Amino acid sequence: IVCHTTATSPISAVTCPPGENLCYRKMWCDAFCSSRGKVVELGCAATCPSKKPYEEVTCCSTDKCNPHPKQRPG
């Protein structure tokens, strides 16, 4: 399938190389971790790469299932 990249280019769903069997959604905190919450760096991965402390990652196998929720003014 294809995944969007918030961490590399701007944001576009491009097919990924061999290895990541699906897409994913990571979250954490940018350079200063502001009050705007964390970021939303989805992309590709072999499997839900979630880990231990605050690395909150997720997955996405449907078509363009990596569109985090943010396009909307308060």
Partner: peptide, 13 residues
């Protein structure tokens, strides 16, 4: 300027 969890269009500041 990010795709943070509160907007998507690259914001300046």
């Amino acid at each position: 300027m990010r795709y943070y969890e509160s907007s998507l269009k690259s914001y300046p500041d």
